[PDB]
Scaffold this motif. Sequence first.
Motif, PDB file in Angstrom:
ATOM      1  N   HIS A 169      92.097 -25.222  14.985  1.00 19.12           N
ATOM      2  CA  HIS A 169      92.116 -24.470  13.772  1.00 19.12           C
ATOM      3  C   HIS A 169      92.708 -25.195  12.550  1.00 19.12           C
ATOM      4  O   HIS A 169      93.014 -24.580  11.572  1.00 19.12           O
ATOM      5  N   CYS A 179      85.153 -19.217  11.007  1.00 20.48           N
ATOM      6  CA  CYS A 179      85.734 -19.372  12.312  1.00 20.48           C
ATOM      7  C   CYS A 179      86.153 -17.993  12.791  1.00 20.48           C
ATOM      8  O   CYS A 179      86.454 -17.123  11.982  1.00 20.48           O
ATOM      9  N   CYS A 181      88.920 -17.318  13.989  1.00 12.39           N
ATOM     10  CA  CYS A 181      90.334 -17.120  13.684  1.00 12.39           C
ATOM     11  C   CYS A 181      90.436 -16.362  12.361  1.00 12.39           C
ATOM     12  O   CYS A 181      91.420 -15.704  12.104  1.00 12.39           O
ATOM     13  N   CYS A 186      87.438 -24.666  10.208  1.00 20.86           N
ATOM     14  CA  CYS A 186      88.178 -25.119  11.333  1.00 20.86           C
ATOM     15  C   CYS A 186      87.457 -26.232  12.091  1.00 20.86           C
ATOM     16  O   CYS A 186      86.232 -26.222  12.205  1.00 20.86           O
TER      17      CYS A 186
HETATM   18 ZN   LIG Z   1      89.864 -21.189  13.094  1.00 19.07          ZN
END
Ligand SMILES: [Zn+2]
Lengths: 325, 324
Positions: A169, A179, A181, A186
Amino acid sequence: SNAMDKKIIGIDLGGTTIKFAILTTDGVVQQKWSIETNILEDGKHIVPSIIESIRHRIDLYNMKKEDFVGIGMGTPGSVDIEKGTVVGAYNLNWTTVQPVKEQIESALGIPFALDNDANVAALGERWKGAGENNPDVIFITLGTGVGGGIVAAGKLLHGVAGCAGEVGHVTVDPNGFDCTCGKRGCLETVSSATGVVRVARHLSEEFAGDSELKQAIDDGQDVSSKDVFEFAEKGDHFALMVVDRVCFYLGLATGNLGNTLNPDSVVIGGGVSAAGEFLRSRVEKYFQEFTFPQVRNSTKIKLAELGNEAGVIGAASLALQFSKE
Amino acid sequence: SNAMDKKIIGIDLGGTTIKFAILTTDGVVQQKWSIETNILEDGKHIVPSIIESIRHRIDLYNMKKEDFVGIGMGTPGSVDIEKGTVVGAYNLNWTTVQPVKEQIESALGIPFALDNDANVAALGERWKGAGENNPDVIFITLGTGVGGGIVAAGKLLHGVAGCAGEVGHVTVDPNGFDCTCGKRGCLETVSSATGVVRVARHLSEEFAGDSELKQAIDDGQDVSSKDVFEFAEKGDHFALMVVDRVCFYLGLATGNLGNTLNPDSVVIGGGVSAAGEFLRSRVEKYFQEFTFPQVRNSTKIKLAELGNEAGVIGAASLALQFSK
Ligand SMILES: [Zn+2]
Ligand SMILES: [Mg+2]
Ligand SMILES: [Mg+2]
Ligand SMILES: [Zn+2]
């Protein structure tokens, strides 16, 4: 001799499979075994299944419980080492903090330690693989996801929230792909099994020729990273464009890790790494662009040596903190 | 001669003054003094002046070598920690290898360790300033260059060649300016006092509207970084643009440190940090853009709190390696 009767257990808890090994205290594997990971019912069956699998192995083989120095475990998510607690293992359906250390230590009566899954793999490659027991080693694993572990000045790093080592990340492209996340660009979006395909899916339009790789990508195939690299090695001009893009980003991210941490080595592991020297080379080449001279001439780009055994090996090593001194 | 009460000495060697401190092993300041730095004659007088100043002080206070755990020194230059040598501190006239550790121990009989300026500033802020003595602290220092140090799992990091902590040479723009180090787009290139100005003088040419910053550049004035920050603070639209840019790069770099190390804090110090909250808050905004939530909502951006005292306190802490 009686020292050679001591054993440590390593557990490699993954989203699909849970792998176990019993090893000598020098980290030679004596036995391995696995079971499926049952994620049903908010993952409440996982820890009991691990307890059961170890109880049954000990019982099956009439093993002597006091030979075991302890148990180490790697797990998805983030781990509070002091607490023995796991947060963020969403893929397991653990939505709540899990008192894993408490449950296992309680059930089993043998000392228990746990850590994040790439952290422990990092320890395994440092101890028995490409890391060569150096005090400063970075492990990066490319598979379904991108993970990592950092050993710096002789110790594995965790940070304030257990998130040290999360190099998947690192933002390599502030304007990149979304991403999971929840930000964009990332390393994981461009370098996991799926990220490589995504990079290829989007470079396709920049390639007016044709190739076996371009055809399959364009057809909707989820071609492995291995196959992508194999087309490249074999001379496929499209595969070579994709690999080039992929290793640029791995080179930037590993480079900036070199610039900040200066480890003796960055070790690349996980499924993609089967690709071997052709991948290591292209990573190393961009790493070299992106690093200052003192780092260029010292930090080495390596391939993992242990394959998928690093997890169980590294996990096992956490058990060594319990030896009688 | 109370062996339960030994003390540590810190030394902060600057190009103009040398700072000293005596601390208890818990890092409480007992005594501070300074002397000027005599750089004449290839810097050959500097370490003898330090030894003299320490010998004399030991004599004043009726102390002896056994009352000290050790001595730590922060220095510019290119350091070899193991050997205890320095070379390439050109503000000191140190163009040849200085055997500082030999000079010190062979004159004082007290164990000595040394490290680079940035690292020692990091140790200070981690121990007694914005780090609040948390095990995971990253310090970064903005000024004439960009420099830094990282404490992780309670230890300063050096890496295999002693380069760890070199944040100013993290690549923030693969296609940016040429850095002194040989590659492009290093953070130092955009966020040092000189880097800020670099960014201003490179965006002005595209900007058209009115700003006092742009007219001054285009008058031919020698614009500075406190000046760029000044103008943005007053609402200068172009100057805010230049600050935005510098902070974007600082966000990215610290953000990625956050993603890889997850410290309790990233501490920002040095000269450019004089802008205070105006700086900190813009850096934090991009830091938040570039971190994933678990890091974004644990690692903190903080301003350095010890100013010029961080160095001497962190240098004292080097001495603690020699305890017992
Ligand atoms: Zn990420
Ligand atoms: Mg990890
Ligand atoms: Mg440093
Ligand atoms: Zn540079």
